[PDB]
């Protein structure tokens, strides 16, 4: 690569996570005040366990799916074989959905938006798993305790795909190029914005998937 790659990749990775950042930032802070009431809040509680997961998992898989076509317009993934294309994946996409969760969370109140508003982890007491819930919750305030921004995201979210030690990979040295020029560039871009100080300050690489791993095998029910 050179100096202007290096520019012209972070650019094109802001670029595509762009027109994948499925919802307006603009929008979403925006509706601050727009807080779920005690009824509302009481009224989704009272729905048997059966309901919410499957409402999740309708929010879930439709975020999934601009997961999905964030990966297409990178360098590289084009020319990448079949088999190989999709095992990142089938790892990976699920763990990016929630990392995207914490544009939706708002530390001064501990919500999520969801279905319209803000809600706090009380708005899924029929999930049966708190704890799980609430991991999840904690995981979205250490990144909301980071003040992360977008073009960071994007970054973020590229490398966690591009993982060319994820088993089953055949092609396997054509990505470790991808995931270098990669690696480079979000660094790159991070001195360049000064902001390494938070590599310390970011998630171990097995608790996000521990956390999405532990995550869809209760979801695997239905
Ligand atoms: C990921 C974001 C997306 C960036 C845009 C906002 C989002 C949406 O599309 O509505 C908000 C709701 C959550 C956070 C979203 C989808 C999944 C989560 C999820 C179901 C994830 C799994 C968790 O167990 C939990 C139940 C807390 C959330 C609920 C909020 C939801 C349903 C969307």
């Given at each position: 690569?050179?100096?202007?790659?290096?520019?012209?990749?972070?650019?094109?990775?802001?670029?595509?996570?762009?027109?994948?950042?499925?919802?307006?930032?603009?929008?979403?802070?925006?509706?601050?005040?727009?807080?779920?009431?005690?009824?509302?809040?009481?009224?989704?509680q009272?729905?048997?366990?059966?309901?919410?997961?499957?409402?999740?998992?309708?929010?879930?898989?439709?975020?999934?799916?601009?997961?999905?076509?964030?990966?297409?317009?990178?360098?590289?993934?084009?020319?990448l074989?079949?088999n190989?294309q999709?095992?990142?994946?089938?790892?990976?996409?699920?763990?990016?959905?929630?990392?995207?969760?914490?544009?939706?969370?708002?530390?001064?109140?501990?919500?999520?938006?969801?279905?319209?508003?803000?809600?706090?982890?009380?708005?899924?007491?029929?999930?049966?798993?708190?704890?799980?819930?609430?991991?999840?919750?904690?995981?979205?305030?250490?990144?909301?305790?980071?003040?992360?921004?977008?073009?960071?995201?994007?970054?973020?979210?590229?490398?966690?795909?591009?993982?060319?030690?994820?088993?089953?990979?055949?092609?396997?040295?054509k990505?470790?190029?991808?995931?270098?020029?990669?690696?480079?560039?979000?660094?790159?871009?991070?001195?360049?914005?000064?902001?390494?100080?938070?590599?310390?300050?970011?998630?171990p690489?097995?608790?996000?998937?521990?956390?999405?791993?532990?995550?869809?095998?209760?979801?695997?029910?239905?």
């Amino acid at each position: 690569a050179s100096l202007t790659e290096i520019e012209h990749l972070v650019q094109s990775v802001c670029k595509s996570y762009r027109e994948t950042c499925q919802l307006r930032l603009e929008d979403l802070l925006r509706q601050r005040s727009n807080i779920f009431s005690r009824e509302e809040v009481t009224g989704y509680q009272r729905k048997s366990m059966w309901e919410m997961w499957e409402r999740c998992a309708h929010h879930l898989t439709e975020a999934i799916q601009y997961v999905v076509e964030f990966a297409k317009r990178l360098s590289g993934f084009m020319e990448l074989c079949q088999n190989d294309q999709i095992v990142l994946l089938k790892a990976g996409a699920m763990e990016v959905v929630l990392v995207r969760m914490c544009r939706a969370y708002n530390a001064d109140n501990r919500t999520v938006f969801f279905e319209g508003k803000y809600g706090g982890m009380e708005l899924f007491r029929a999930l049966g798993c708190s704890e799980l819930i609430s991991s999840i919750f904690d995981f979205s305030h250490s990144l909301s305790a980071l003040h992360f921004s977008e073009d960071e995201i994007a970054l973020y979210t590229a490398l966690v795909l591009i993982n060319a030690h994820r088993p089953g990979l055949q092609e396997k040295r054509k990505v470790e190029q991808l995931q270098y020029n990669l690696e480079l560039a979000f660094h790159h871009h991070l001195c360049k914005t000064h902001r390494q100080s938070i590599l310390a300050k970011l998630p171990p690489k097995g608790k996000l998937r521990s956390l999405c791993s532990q995550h869809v095998e209760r979801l695997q029910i239905f």
